[PDB]
Amino acid sequence: SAEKQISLYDGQPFISEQDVAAGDPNTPALTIEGPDGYVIAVDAGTPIAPEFRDSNGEKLDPSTRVIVQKCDRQGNPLGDGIIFNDTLGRFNYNKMRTDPDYMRKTAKSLMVDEREIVKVFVDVPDGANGYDAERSRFTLGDDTSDFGKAVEIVDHDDLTEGETQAV
Amino acid sequence: NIGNLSAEKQISLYDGQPFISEQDVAAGDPNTPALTIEGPDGYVIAVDAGTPIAPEFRDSNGEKLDPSTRVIVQKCDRQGNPLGDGIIFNDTLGRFNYNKMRTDPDYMRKTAKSLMVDEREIVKVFVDVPDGANGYDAERSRFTLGDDTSDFGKAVEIVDHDDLTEGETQAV
Amino acid sequence: NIGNLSAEKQISLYDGQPFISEQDVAAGDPNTPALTIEGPDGYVIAVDAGTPIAPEFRDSNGEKLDPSTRVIVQKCDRQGNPLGDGIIFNDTLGRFNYNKMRTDPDYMRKTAKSLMVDEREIVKVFVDVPDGANGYDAERSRFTLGDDTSDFGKAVEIVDHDDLTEGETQAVKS
Amino acid sequence: QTQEYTLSHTGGLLGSSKVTTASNQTAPQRETAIISFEVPRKFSEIEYVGQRDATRFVPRTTEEITGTANDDTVVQLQANIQPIAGEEDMADQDYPVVVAYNVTQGAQVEIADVNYATDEVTLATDPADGDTVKLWPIMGDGEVQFRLVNQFGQEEGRVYPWATPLYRWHDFPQLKRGREINLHGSVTWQENETVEVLLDAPQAITWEDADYPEGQYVSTFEQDVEITL
Amino acid sequence: QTQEYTLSHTGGLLGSSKVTTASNQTAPQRETAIISFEVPRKFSEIEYVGQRDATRFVPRTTEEITGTANDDTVVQLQANIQPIAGEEDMADQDYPVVVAYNVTQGAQVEIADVNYATDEVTLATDPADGDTVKLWPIMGDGEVQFRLVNQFGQEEGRVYPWATPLYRWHDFPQLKRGREINLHGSVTWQENETVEVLLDAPQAITWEDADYPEGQYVSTFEQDVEITL
Amino acid sequence: QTQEYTLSHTGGLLGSSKVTTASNQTAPQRETAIISFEVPRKFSEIEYVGQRDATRFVPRTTEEITGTANDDTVVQLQANIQPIAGEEDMADQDYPVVVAYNVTQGAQVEIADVNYATDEVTLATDPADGDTVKLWPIMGDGEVQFRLVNQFGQEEGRVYPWATPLYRWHDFPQLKRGREINLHGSVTWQENETVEVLLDAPQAITWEDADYPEGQYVSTFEQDVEITL
C-alpha cells in the first residue's frame, strides 16, 4: 500500500545536524524537514535512540536534556505541539536500543506536511563537554521488530485527503 | 474637582519602565532580543494598524549602529516562544533619521498591522547586526511605540481587565 | 482531627509582615507614606465601619512624635495614585495614649467607614509632621488595624478570591 | 460529662511523662517545637476552642554577663524588650520584663533604669571583675502556632494557619476579662494524638536553669481546655 | 464667559503670592512638588484639558566647578544631556542645552564641543586656578505628574495616573503645531483648590540663582488654561 | 491544552531562580527541605499525580579521607550502602554506588571490592601520606515527603502523609516500565504556590562540590508533570 513503515536516523539527506556548545539550548543539534510530496506520521508512541556523545565518544552529562519540538515554516519554534521533553542521563543506550521496556515512546502523535520542520534542542546547562554529531546518532522508529512501532510515510500524490492533511 | 475618565487610556511606552525589560547585545546574534515587553497582570494593551516607533539603537560610544543592522518587532505568546503568524515592523536600522523622525509626520514610521496583548504575553525586539560591528548597549539607547503627547500621532491603548464584559471574548 | 473553617478569617495586621511595606520619614514631608499596604494576589480583605488602629509612630530615640503631628490613612488604586473618594482615619498623633489604647474599649479608635481591597490595591499612611521636629523611624515603631484576639473589638476579614462567585462584582466595584 | 480544666508547662494531668519541654533552633531560624501535650492513659478526648478558650505564655531567654574592676552597670541585649501591660516601670509591670542574678554573690541584682527600645539596661548594683551574672529578659520578635500528630509524626496539619507574635502576646494584658486572649481554632484529639506548640524566632528560650530565683521555672505556658472527663 | 489664558512660573495672574516655586528631594528620590497654582481672590474656576491644552517646561540644574593652573577645559556631569529639537549644535538648538558663567570674571563661558551621550563637555575658554564657574545644564531622567488639593492637603488624587519623562519633554520640539504637547487629563478647581505639579528625579532643579545671565530665571514652566473669567 | 513535561534539580523551566537546592540538618535529625519548585512567571498551573506520574532521585553524600605512608586501602562509612538494581558488581549497577577522587592526584580512584553490608570498602589503588580523597557514596536510611506552600510559608499540609524510604528508592530499579515508581498523591499549584520536597535522615546530602568528576552534579532529582501550558 501507499503506507510504508520506516525508521529514521542521522545519515540521511533531508535531515540536518550541527555541533553544539555548552549552555546554548536554542541551537538545534538536529533539524528534520519535510520533503516535497512525502508526508510522514508518528502515532502516540514510537521509540527514539537519543545517542548524544562527546567528541571523545562519551555520553554527555546526565543533567543534559533533550527537547524534541515541532516547528511550522519560518524556522520558528512552536509550543502547542511538542514531543519528548526528557533528560539525557536516563537511557542506558546499550539496552534501550533492544529491550521493549527500556524503549521510549513519544508523548503524543504527530504529522509533518511537505514543508514543516522539527528540531532537537539540547540543554547542556554548563561545565560540560561540547557536543559532536559524527560521534552521535539518533532514531525514531523500529519497523523491523514486532512489539514496537515505526514511522508511517506516505506519498502525497496517492491521496484525496491531501488538502485536509494540509489544513 | 477632577473629571471622570474611561477605562481606555492613551500612553507611550519606553525603556525606563519596570515591566519592560532589556539586555545588551553583541554582533551577529539576531536571536538575542534587546527588549522584552511583557504583559502585566490585570491589563490588556492594544495597538491599532499604525503606531510610531522611535527605534534608537546606538553603540556604547553613542553612535547608531551600522545601517545594515535590522530591527524586527515580534509578538510572542506565553512559553517565551517566538511566533511568526503575528509580527510587526521588519525594518533596517539605517533608515530612521532619529533627530527628525521622533517629531515629523513624514519621517514617522508606523506598524504593519494591529495587535493585542493579554495579561501574560511577550513581545520581543530582535536585532540583526550583520557581523564584526560594534556591540550594542541599552543605557545609551531608547525606544518607544506611541506618540500620545502629539495630536497627529497615535498612542498605545491600555485597559484594565476588570472593566470589561467582553473580557471573555478578548480572552478567546 | 481539625475543625473545618470558613474562607472568612478574622485577623489583625501589623508591621512585620511580608506584603506590607514601610519606610522612614523626615519632618515637613507629609506626602511621604511611612506605611504602604499592598493587596496580595488572590486575597481580598475587608474592614467594616469601625476597627481599631494602634498608630504607634515614635522617634529614632523611642519617643512619640509631636502632638501636632497628624496621621491620614488613605486608599489608593494602582498607579501609586492617592484618592480622595475613599479615605479613612484623619486624626492627630498626640492623642491616643498608646499604653492603654491598645487595650481599653474606650480609647480604642475606630475607622470612619468601611473598606474593601482587591487583589492589588494600595493603602498609604501619610504622616504630617509640622516642621523642624524629630524625624521618623519604623523599627522603633509599630502599627495595627484590628482586635481579633479579644471579645469586644473588631478584626479584619480576609477571604481567598477563589472561594467566591461575586469576585467579578467586587472587581467592578474596585 | 464535659468539664473544663487547666494545663501547665509541668506535670499536672500528665505526670511530666506525657509532656515535654524543649528549647528551639536559633542559628537557622526554624519553626521548632518547645512543648507537647500527649493525651495520658485515661481520657477519651480533649478539646480546644479559640474564641472561647484562654491562654497564657510567659517566655524568657537566658544569657551570661561577666563583670569588671571598672564595671559598666550597663548592658545591651540582642532580644527586643517591651512592656507587658503599659509602662516600663518595673514596680508595676504585672511581672518584671527582666530578672537578674549574680552567681558569685548568690543574690539578686536589682535594676535602676532601662533604655527602653534601645534594648539596653542600667543596673542598680556594681558587679566585680570576673563576676558572673545571669539574666532572663522576656522573649519577643517571634511567631507561634499549633499543630497535631497522628500517633506517629504524620501531621494532620495545623489548627489555624496564620501565626501570632510574642511582642503582641506580652502587649495584651493577661488577667482581664475581654482583654484576655482567645485565638482561632477548634480541634479535638484522643489518646496519643499529641499536640505540639511551635515557635519560630531567632532567640533562644528557657524553661529552667536551676539557678533562676523565682520558683524553679524560668518561663511558662498555661492553658484552658474542655475535657470529656 | 470662558476665555483662554496663560500661566507662568512667576506672578502674572497670581502676584507671586498665590504661587510658589520649590526645589526637590535628591538623596532620597521623592515625587516632590516644585510649583503650585492657587486660585486667587477673584476667579470662579479654572479648567485644564489635556488633548486640547498646551504646556511648556524648560528645566535646568546647577553645579559649581573650580579651575586650575593647568585647567582642564573639560567637565563631566551627573545629569544626562540630550538635544531638544534635533542635533546637538548649540547654534541651532532652539535654546541651549548648557549655560555657563565664570564668577571671578563676571562673564559668560562659551562652549567649543560636547561629548554628547558621554555627558561630558569641552569648553572654549581657559579657567584659572581657584576660579569658580556656575553651569546650568538641562534636566533629564525624571518623571512628572499633576495632582490636586482640597483646600487643606487632602488630595483628591491625581489628574492622570501615568507619568511623563523629561528627556522626552526636551525631545518633542516645542513651538510647532501638532508637534505641541497635549497630555491627558481633564479637571476643574475653584478658589483655594490649589494644584501642584510633581517631579520625581535624582537631580536637583533651579528656578533662580541671581547670577544666571539670561533673564533672572534659570528654568520655567508655562501653560495654557481655559478660565471662567 | 495539557502537555506533559519534565523537571530537574537544575534550571530548565525555572532558570535556576524559581528553584533552589539545599543540604539538610544532621546533628538533630529534622525533616528539612533540600529542594523547592516555585511556579515561574508564566504558567497557569501544574499538576502532580502519583499512581500516574513518575519520579527519579539519585542521592549521594560526601566525606573526606586522608592517606598514610602505610596506606590502608580500606574505609568504613557511617552511611549504609546497598545495591540499586541487583548485585553489588560495580560494572553492572546501572550507576555506581560509590565514587571516589583523589585531590593531590587530580584523578579517579577505582574500587577493587566492597564489604557489602559491613559498610566498608576496599580500593584498587594506594593513596599517599597526607593525601586527600573525596568520596560520594549513595544515601540510604532516610525518609522523604512532599508538601505545599500558600505563597508565604503557610503550609496547606502535605501531599500524602506517609513517608517513603531511600534504601527502598535505590532498590526499585529505575528505568523499567511497571517497575517504575508511582507514589500516591494528587495536587495542583498555581503561581508562587511553591512545592518543597522534604527529607529526614541523619546523613548529609550533596548537590555539588565543583570537584566531583561526573558532570558537575553529585546528586539529582527529576520528575514528570502534567502542565496546563
Task: State the virtual CA torsion across E127, E132, E138, E140 in degrees, nearest 10.
Answer: 110
| Contact status, residue C31 vs residue C23, Cβ threshold 8 Å | no
Give the minimum alpha-carbon distance from C99 to chain D in angstroms, rounded to a whole number: 5
Q: In 3-state terms, what secondary structure has residue E90?
A: helix
Residues of F in contact with B118 (CB under 8 A): none
User: Which chains touch D (3+ CB pairs under 8 A)?
Assistant: C, F
Q: Which amino acid is at D111?
A: I
User: In this complex, is the C-beta atom of F222 within 8 Å of any C-beta atom belonging to chain A?
Assistant: yes
Angle made by CA atoms D152, D158, D164, in degrees to the nearest 5: 135
Give all strands of the β-sheet with F74-76 in edge-to-edge order. F74-76, F120-123, F111-115
Distance from E50 to chain C by nearest Cα, in Å?
Answer: 18
- C-beta of residue E171 within 8 angstroms of C-beta of residue E81: no
Q: Work out the angle at residue C74's Cα, subtended by the Cα atoms of residues C73 and C75, and round it to the nearest 5 degrees.
A: 140
| Cell 508511517, located at residue | A152
Residue ranges of the alpha helices (H) in D61-181? Answer: 166-171
Mutate: best of B74, B79, B126, partner A, most A CBs <10 A: B79
Parallel, antiparallel, or unpaired for β F220-228 and C43-47? unpaired
Among candidates E30, E33, E157 on the partner chain, residue whose Cβ is nearest the Cβ of C84 = E157
DSSP 8-class letter at E11? S
Q: Looking at beta carbons, which residues of chain F come within 8 Å of C11?
A: none
Q: Which residue has the cell 467592578?
A: C172
Experimental method: cryo-EM
Q: What is the resolution of this structure in A?
A: 3.7
Instruction: Quote the CA–CA distance of E89 and E198 in Å, as a whole number.
Output: 31
- The residue of chain D with its CA nearest to that of F33 is D30
Q: Which subunits have 3 or more CB–CB pairs within 8 Å of chain B? A: A, C, E, F
Among candidate residues D108, D111, D128, D129, the one with its CA nearest the CA of residue D120: D111
Positions of E strands within chain E: 2-7, 32-37, 46-49, 55-58, 74-76, 100-102, 107-108, 111-115, 120-123, 133-135, 145-148, 186-189, 195-199, 220-228
**Burial classification of residue E73, based on how many CB atoms lie within 10 Å of its CB (0-12 exposed, 13-18 middle, 19 or more buried):** middle
CA distance B119 to B167: 11
CA F3, CA F40: separation in Å to the nearest integer? 16
Measured at the CA of F222, the angle between CA F221 and CA F228, to 5 degrees, comes to 135
- Taking the C-alpha atoms of residue A73 and residue A82, their distance in angstroms, rounded to an integer, is 15
Distance from CA of B95 to the nearest CA of C (A): 36
**Separation of alpha carbons B35 and B20, rounded Å:** 7
Contact with chain B for residue A72, Cβ under 8 A: yes
Phi, psi at F141, each rounded to 5°: 60, 65
- The single-letter DSSP state of residue D3 is E
- The b-or-e profile of B50-77 (16+ CB within 10 A means b, else e) is ebbbbbbbbbeeeebbbeebbbbbbbbb
User: Contact A19/A129 with Cβ under 8 angstroms?
Assistant: no
Query: Is B120 within 8 Å of F42 when comparing Cβ atoms?
Result: yes
Residues B83/B35, Cβ–Cβ less than 8 Å: no
Give me C173's grid cell: 466595584
Q: C-alpha cell of C146?
A: 484590628
Q: Is E93 exposed, middle or buried (0-12, 13-18, 19+ CB in 10 A)?
A: middle
Which residue, B45, B48, B59, is CA-closest to B17? B45
Kindly report the nearest CA distance between residue F51 and chain D, in angstroms. 21
Touch of A by F (3+ CB pairs closer than 8 Å) = yes
- CA dihedral over C37, C39, C41, C46, signed as positive or negative: positive
Substitution target in C41, C119, C120, C161 with the highest count of F β-carbons within 10 Å is: C41
Alpha-carbon span B128 to B26, nearest angstrom: 10
The 10 Å Cβ neighbour count of residue C107 is: 15
8 Å CB contact between D47 and D224? no
Q: What is the amino acid identity at position A90? A: R
Return the ∠ at Cα E122 (arms to E120 and E125), rounded to 5°.
145
C-alpha closest to that of E205 among E31, E17, E25: E25
* CB neighbour list of residue E60: distance below 8 Å, 6 or more residues apart: E99, E136, E137, E138, E139, E205, E206, E218, E219
For testing contact with chain B, the best of A26, A78, A116 (most B CBs within 10 A): A78
Chains C and D touch (3+ CB pairs under 8 A): yes
Nearest beta carbon to residue A79 from set B31, B77, B84: B77
Q: For residue C45, which phi and psi values (nearest 5 degrees)?
A: -125, 165
DSSP conformation letters of A103-125: ----SS-EEE-SS-EEEEEEE--
R_g (Cα) of chain F, nearest Å? 19
Question: How many angstroms separate the CA atoms of C23 and C40, rounded?
Answer: 19
Round to whole Å and give the CA distance between A43 and B156.
46
DSSP string for chain B: -B----S-EEE--BSS-SSSEE--B-SS-TTS-SEEEEPPTTEEEEE-S--------BBTTS-B--TT-EEEEEEE-STT-EEEEEEEEEEESTT--HHHHTT-TTT----SS-EEE-SS-EEEEEEE--SSSPPB-STT---BS---SSSSS--EEEEEGGG-SSHHHHH-
Q: Residues near F58 by Cβ (< 8 Å), separated by ≥ 6? A: F95, F138, F219, F220, F221
CA distance A151 to F59: 38
Residue D38's Cβ-count burial label (10 Å; 0-12, 13-18, 19+) is: middle
C-alpha pair distances (Å), F174 with each of D48, E183, F180:
47, 65, 6
- Residue F95 backbone dihedrals phi, psi, to 5 degrees: -175, 150
Domain residue spans in chain A? 1-167
Q: Tell me the domain boundaries of chain D.
A: 1-59+140-229, 60-139
Beta-strand relationship, B43-47 and A117-123: unpaired
Q: Which residues of B touch E85 (CB under 8 A)?
A: 103
Compute the nearest-CA separation of E149 from chain C (Å): 9
Compare all CA atoms of chain F with the CA of D27 and give the residue at the minimum distance. Answer: F25
Q: Tell me whether residues C18 and F152 touch, CB distance under 8 A.
A: yes
Distance CA C117, CA C171 (A): 9
CA distance C14 to D171: 13
- Give the pairing type, strands C21-22 and C33-38: antiparallel
Residues with Cβ within 8 Å of residue B172, at least 6 apart in sequence: none
Residues linked to residue F123 through DSSP beta bridges, in sequence order: F111
CA dihedral (B7, B12, B18, B24) positive or negative: positive
- CB contact under 8 Å between D188 and C150, yes or no, is no
Residue numbers in F near D30 (CB within 8 A) = 30
- On whether any CB of chain C is under 8 Å from the CB of F41, the answer is no
Name the residue of chain C whose CA is nearest to E158's CA.
Answer: C81
Element (H, E) at A166: helix A162-166
Look at chain A and count its residues: 167
**Side-chain half-sphere of C56: how many Cα atoms within 13 Å?**
19
CA of B52: how far to CAs of B86, B111, B117, in Å? Answer: 18, 7, 17
Q: Nearest residue on chain C to D52, judged by CA atoms?
A: C151
In whole angstroms, how far apart are CA D123 and each of C62, D70, D115, D117? 20, 14, 11, 16
**E193 and E46 Cβ atoms separated by less than 8 Å:** no
- Cα–Cα distances (Å) from E17 to E9, E20, E34, E36, E38, in that order, read 12, 7, 15, 11, 9
Q: Across the interface, do A73 and B84 touch by the CB < 8 Å criterion?
A: yes
Q: Looking at the DSSP assignment, which residues form a beta bridge with residue C90?
A: C72
Rounded CA-CA distance D97/D137 in Å is: 6
- Report chain D residues whose CB lies below 8 A from the CB of F196: none
Tell me whether residues F155 and D158 touch, CB distance under 8 A: yes
Chain D interface disruption, residue of C10, C100, C151, C156, most D CBs within 10 A = C151
Contact by Cβ (8 Å): E129, E72: no
Which residues of chain B are within 8 Å of residue E181 when distances are taken between CB atoms? 149-150
How far apart, in whole angstroms, are the C-alpha atoms of residue F186 and residue F52? Answer: 9
Are E and F close enough to touch, i.e. 3+ CB pairs under 8 angstroms? no
- C-alpha A29/C-alpha A123 separation (Å) is 10
Q: Is the Cβ–Cβ distance between E160 and E146 less than 8 Å?
A: yes
Q: Which of E155, E161, E218 is nearest to E184 (CA)?
A: E161
Between CA E94 and CA D97 the distance in angstroms is 71
State yes or no: chains F and C have 3 or more CB pairs below 8 A: yes
In a 13 Å sphere around the CA of B162, the CA atoms on its Cβ side amount to 15
Rg (CA), chain C: 17
For residue B126, the distance in angstroms to the closest alpha carbon of chain E comes to 24
Residues 6+ apart with CB under 8 A from D222: D6, D7, D8, D9, D55, D56, D57
Distance of CA E56 to the CA centre of its chain: 9
User: Are C77 and E150 inside 8 Å of each other by CB?
Assistant: no
- Is the Cα dihedral A136, A140, A142, A147 positive or negative? positive
Q: Tell me how close the Cα of A17 comes to any Cα of chain F, in angstroms.
A: 23
A165 phi and psi, to 5 degrees?
A: -70, -20
Q: Which positions in chain C touch B42 (Cβ < 8 Å)?
A: 119-120
Local structure of D47: helix, strand or coil: strand
Report angle CA D132, D136, D139 to the nearest 5 degrees.
145
CA distance B23 to D94: 61
Q: What SS3 state is found at E32?
A: strand
| Interface residue of B36, B37, B41, B78 to substitute, partner F, most F CBs within 10 Å | B78
Tell me the CB-side half-sphere exposure of residue F173, using CA atoms within 13 A: 14
Question: In angstroms, rounded to a whole number, what is the distance separating the alpha carbons of residues C80 and E155?
Answer: 13
Nearest to D31 by CA among F24, C133, F154, A31: F154
E117 to B140: CB separation less than 8 angstroms, yes or no: yes
- The answer to whether residue C83 neighbours chain B at the CB level (below 8 Å) is no
Cβ count within 10 A of residue B49: 11
Q: How far from chain centre, in Å, is Cα F108?
A: 21
Query: Which residue, chain included where needed, has cell 565543583?
Result: F210
Could you tell me if B42 lies within 8 Å of chain C, comparing CB atoms?
yes
Nearest to F80 by CA among F136, F118, F128: F118
Q: Does D156 touch chain C (CB under 8 A)?
A: yes
Mutation test of the interface with chain B: which of F1, F2, F42, choosing the one with the most B Cβ atoms within 10 A?
F42
Alpha carbon distances (Å) from A135 to A87, C160, D25: 19, 56, 54
* Distance in angstroms (rounded) separating the CA atoms of residues B170 and B4: 25
**Chain F nearest C-alpha distance from B25 (Å):** 20
Three-class SS state of A131:
strand
Query: Does F177 contact chain B (CB < 8 Å)?
Result: no
B30 touching A (Cβ < 8 Å): no
For residue F35, which of F67, F53, F58, F68 has the smallest C-alpha distance?
F58
HEC string of chain F equals CEEEEEECCCCCCCCCCCCCECCCCCCCCCCEEEEEECCCCCCCCEEEECCCCCEEEECECCCCECCCCCCCCEEECCCCCCCCCCCCCHHHCCCCCCCEEECCCCEECCEEEEECCCCEEEECCCCCCCCCEEECCECCCCCCEEEECCCCCCCCCECCCCCCCHHHHHHCCCCCCCCCCCCCCEEEECCCCCEEEEECCCCCCCCCCCCCCCCCCCCEEEEEEEEEC
B77 contact A CB<8A: yes
F42 touches chain B (CB under 8 A): yes
Question: What cell does D61 get?
Answer: 531567654
Q: Classify the C-alpha dihedral A126-A127-A128-A130 as positive or negative.
A: positive
